[PDB]
Every structure is written in structure tokens, then in C-alpha cells.
Amino acid sequence: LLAEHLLKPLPADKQIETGPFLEAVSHLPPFFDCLGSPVFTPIKADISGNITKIKAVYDTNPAKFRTLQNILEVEKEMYGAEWPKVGATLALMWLKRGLRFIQVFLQSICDGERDENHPNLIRVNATKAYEMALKKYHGWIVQKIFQAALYAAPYKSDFLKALSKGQNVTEEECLEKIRLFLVNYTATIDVIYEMYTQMNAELNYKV
Amino acid sequence: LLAEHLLKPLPADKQIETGPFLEAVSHLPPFFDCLGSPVFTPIKADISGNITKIKAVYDTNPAKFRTLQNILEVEKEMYGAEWPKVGATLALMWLKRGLRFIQVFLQSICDGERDENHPNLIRVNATKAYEMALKKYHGWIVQKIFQAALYAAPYKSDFLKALSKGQNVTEEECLEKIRLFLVNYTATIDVIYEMYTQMNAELNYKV
Ligand SMILES: CCCCCCCCCCCCC/C=C/[C@@H](O)[C@H](CO[C@@H]1O[C@H](COS(=O)(=O)O)[C@H](O)[C@H](OS(=O)(=O)O)[C@H]1O)NC(=O)CCCCCCCCCCC
Ligand SMILES: CCCCCCCCCCCCC/C=C/[C@@H](O)[C@H](CO[C@@H]1O[C@H](COS(=O)(=O)O)[C@H](O)[C@H](OS(=O)(=O)O)[C@H]1O)NC(=O)CCCCCCCCCCC
């Protein structure tokens, strides 16, 4: 699945076309279902909601919103002082954190990071991803909820199986496809984070 | 708010009309927002989803589905062995548990139940409601998530204020209106639970 929906390579000008980006990331919310528990359903819903919101804005005028940069710059001009805590800019501000979670989690698994005492769990990998992508934007109650939910995570072997079901491939081949996916995905997420910095569109509030 | 949307009294035959029931309970999901935290948003969404699902079935043929009993009996006949774990029957099987939670929580608050050490919290009341209505249908991970989320609950004084905002009433008057609401609400929920028993439509699985 993951490598059937590669993100586009980054052009020299590092502009990310909105339409194709949304099409690519729209295949990611089911990722959380390969975890195999309803504890992950509200997570899938929040990420899906960001995508829907960005698409809704884009759809008002696909030309005006041709790139993600166009979204931020247009909304900055359209709105007053509520920006960047509004519209597709806010939706993408949160979406990028979820996309980063997925990135760091997968890279960690591919890099062979594991608890040597429990090498068939993915807790260490998910925890690292959470710390790096999301933790600092959650109050202590939400952080407590994450720690609890992590117990729902599947066995690594089963998780990787779920990502390749039907394909009849080895775990080694599965990890190769994940690595391929991570190239343009990681590059794209980095560019989005950098855009947020350049545009002064990043906010640090906790929920 | 609560007592502006009283449930209908129960007729002698204890049949509950589907249309008016759905109209009444459709005012309850915002209840969870008077708690004043996004930790409660996924809860509001699950309860809303049950309501939407029941309404969707009803809307296919309001006459056929005139009462909640009609829903169970019609679906039992329509479906095979997947019933009652299907359709509006399953949706109502879960909705009733949420409605019972709300009932027990409110009754507990009105009955003056409190932790004498922390009398302005509503933790004891919510915990009682959870134990009585939902706990046994949750695995340990979800139960852990509830304990954590309960820390998000507001102060009692603030919760009751939120329920009467704009009305300029005393807490004593607010509690009187809640008590009024609880009469036909409690009666109706009891009848639904009893119907589930009579129809052998209740399932005891955990999530
Ligand atoms: C009785 C049963 C037990 C109780 C159950 C309690 C449930 C606990 C629920 C915890 C929350 C679930 C996950 C959701 C988290 C979200 O609060 C945050 C912030 O969400 C943003 O809030 C914003 C609020 O706007 S503001 O008021 O103006 O500030 C916006 O709504 C924004 O959406 S937008 O499109 O409209 O722009 C929205 O994403 N979301 C996240 O943290 C992202 C979640 C991604 C997680 C990545 C994967 C990790 C999951 C663990 C996997 C091991
Ligand atoms: C990184 C961020 C941190 C991680 C966040 C993790 C999020 C944790 C989420 C925990 C779950 C949130 C609450 C939802 C609970 C639901 O799983 C259960 C069961 O739901 C049912 O499942 C069913 C599954 O069907 S089956 O597969 O065939 O079995 C159906 O989907 C059914 O819907 S239906 O309309 O389609 O029929 C549906 O209600 N719901 C509940 O427990 C009810 C929740 C009401 C709670 C009442 C208020 C208490 C809240 C605490 C307040 C102090």
C-alpha cells in the first residue's frame, strides 16, 4: 500500500502542488487501521478532518491555491489577526505533525530501532515519533491518553504483514518499499515545516 | 438547555415513538461540551454517530419504524444471524449505554453525591456513571483512557453554570430543572434496556 502512493519528487523551487499532495496523503489515514484497534479511530478522524478542510479551501479556487505556499500566502492576506490560527493554514499546521509522526515512526522501524528486551513490539518507535512530532502540543491529560493507547499497538511482525497483505512479499521487501516511500515523503514534510517557519505560520499552543 | 428538550412521557403500552425520541436525544451530544475540553470530542462523535445511524434507518420508512420496538422487530426479521450486531439495533445498543451514563451522572450530582474532600469536582459522579453504564464493555486499555480523560472534567460549580448559561438562575433552580429532565429520561432509558432484554437484542462484548 504505502509505496503504491508515492509522493511526487520536490521540484527545484520546492513548491508543493496542493492537488497531488492531498491525493497522496488521502491514502494515509487507513495506515492507523493497520494497527488493528478502535483506540486509533479518533486519530484517523482528526487527520482526515485536516485533509478535508484543506481540500475544501483548495476546491474554492484550485488555481489560486495551486501550491501549499499559495494557501498560506493567500490566507495570510485574506484574513486578519486570527491567521495563522484559521482555515487551511491551521489544518495543515496540525496535519504536518501527524504526517511527521508517521514519518519518524516508519523511519525508526526501518532503521532497526527496537527494545532488545521486546523486539517484536513497536512501542519504542511510536514513543520516539510521538516525542518528536506531537508531544509538546499536548497537555498532560492528552499525553497520559497517548501512553495508554500505545498499549493497543500491534506486534511489529503483524504490523508489517498488514502493510503488505496480499502482496506475498518478505518482511525485508516490505521494509524496502517503506524506505522508498520515506524518501519523497520525508523531503516534502521537511519543506512544509520550513515553509511554516519562513511564513511565521507556526503556533506552539497545547491542547 | 436540558429541560428545554424534555422527553415525552411514556404511554401505557410503553412504546417509544422513534421520531420524537431521536429529536429529543439529538440535543444531548453538546452536553459533553459543557465539560469544556476536547478530550470529550470523540465521545460526542460516537454518540452522534449512533443517532445518525438510527435516523438513517428510520428515514427509509418512518411508518415501518414508528417505534423503537418496531426497529428491533423489523431488523430481527430482515437480517440473518448477524442481528442484533447490525443496523439501528446495534446503534441503539450502544446509544442506550451513553444515555444511561448521562442519566446516572446527572442523578448522582442531583442526589448530592460527592467526595467530601473535593466537593467541587464531579469525578466521583462520573466514575459511578462509567462503572454503571459502560465500564464492562471496555477492555483495560479503554478503561485506562477513561480514568485519564476524567481529569479533564470541569468543576461542578462551573459545569452547572454551563448548563444554565444566560438563564440567570441559581444552582438550586438549575438542579430542579435537571431533576425534571431526569423523570421521563430515566423512565425511557429503563424501557429501552428492558426491550433489549425482552427481544434478546443485548450483546456483552468488549471493545
Ligand atoms: C469513556 C471512553 C473513554 C474516554 C475517551 C477520551 C478520548 C480522548 C481523545 C483524545 C484526542 C484524540 C486525538 C485528537 C487530538 C486533537 O485534539 C489534536 C488537535 O486537533 C486540532 O485541533 C484544532 C482546534 O483548533 S483551535 O481551537 O483553533 O486551536 C483544529 O480543530 C484542527 O483541525 S482543523 O482541520 O479544523 O484545523 C485539529 O486537527 N490533534 C492532534 O494532536 C493530531 C493527532 C495525530 C496523532 C498522530 C498519530 C499518533 C497516535 C498514536 C498512535 C500510536
Ligand atoms: C496521540 C493522541 C492520543 C491518542 C488518542 C487515543 C484515542 C482513544 C479513543 C477511545 C475511544 C473513544 C470513545 C469511543 C468508544 C467506542 O469505541 C465505543 C464503541 O463504539 C461502537 O462501536 C461499534 C462497533 O461495531 S462492531 O464492530 O460491530 O462491534 C459501532 O461502531 C457503534 O456505532 S454504530 O452507530 O455504527 O452502531 C459504536 O457506537 N463506544 C462507547 O463506549 C460509547 C461512548 C459513550 C461514553 C459516555 C460518556 C463517557 C465519557 C467520559 C466523560 C467523563
Residue numbers in the entry:
A (entry chain A), B (entry chain A): 3 to 209
What are the paper's exact sentences on this?
Human glycolipid transfer protein (hsGLTP) forms the prototypical GLTP fold and is characterized by a broad transfer selectivity for glycosphingolipids (GSLs). In human GLTP, a glycolipid headgroup recognition centre located on the protein surface enables selective binding of the GSL head and ceramide amide groups via multiple specific interactions. Encapsulation of lipid chains within the hydrophobic pocket involves a cleft-like gating mechanism that results in two glycolipid-binding modes. To elucidate the structural dynamics of the GLTP–GSL dimer and associated adaptations, we comparatively analyzed nine novel crystal structures of wild-type GLTP (wtGLTP) and the sulfatide-specific mutants D48V and A47D/D48V complexed with N-lauroyl-containing monosulfatide (N-lauroyl-3-O-sulfo-galactosylceramide; hereafter referred to as 12:0 monoSF) and disulfatide (N-lauroyl-3,6-di-O-sulfo-galactosylceramide; hereafter referred to as 12:0 diSF) in different crystal forms and compared them with previously studied GLTP–24:1 monoSF complexes.
Disulfatide and all amino-acid residues of the GLTP recognition centre are clearly visible in the electron-density map. The protein structure displays no disturbance compared with wtGLTP complexed with monosulfatides. Hence, we can assume that the disulfatide found in the malaria parasite Plasmodium falciparum can also be bound by human GLTP. The first noticeable deviations in the surface contact areas occur in wtGLTP–disulfatide complexes, which probably indicate a slightly different mutual orientation of monomers compared with wtGLTP–monosulfatide complexes. Indeed, careful comparison reveals some monomer–monomer′ contact redistribution in the dimer in the region of the α6–α6′ and α2–α2′ protein interactions and lipid–protein′ contacts. To elucidate the dynamics of intermolecular interactions in the GLTP–disulfatide complex, we comparatively analyzed two crystal forms of wtGLTP and two crystal forms of the D48V mutant complexed with 12:0 diSF. The crystals of the wtGLTP–disulfatide complex represent ‘open’ and ‘closed’ conformations of the dimeric arrangement. Interestingly, ligand adaptations also emerge with wtGLTP complexes bound with disulfatide. In contrast, the 6-O-sulfo group adopts different conformations/positions that depend on the protein (wild type or D48V) or the crystal type.
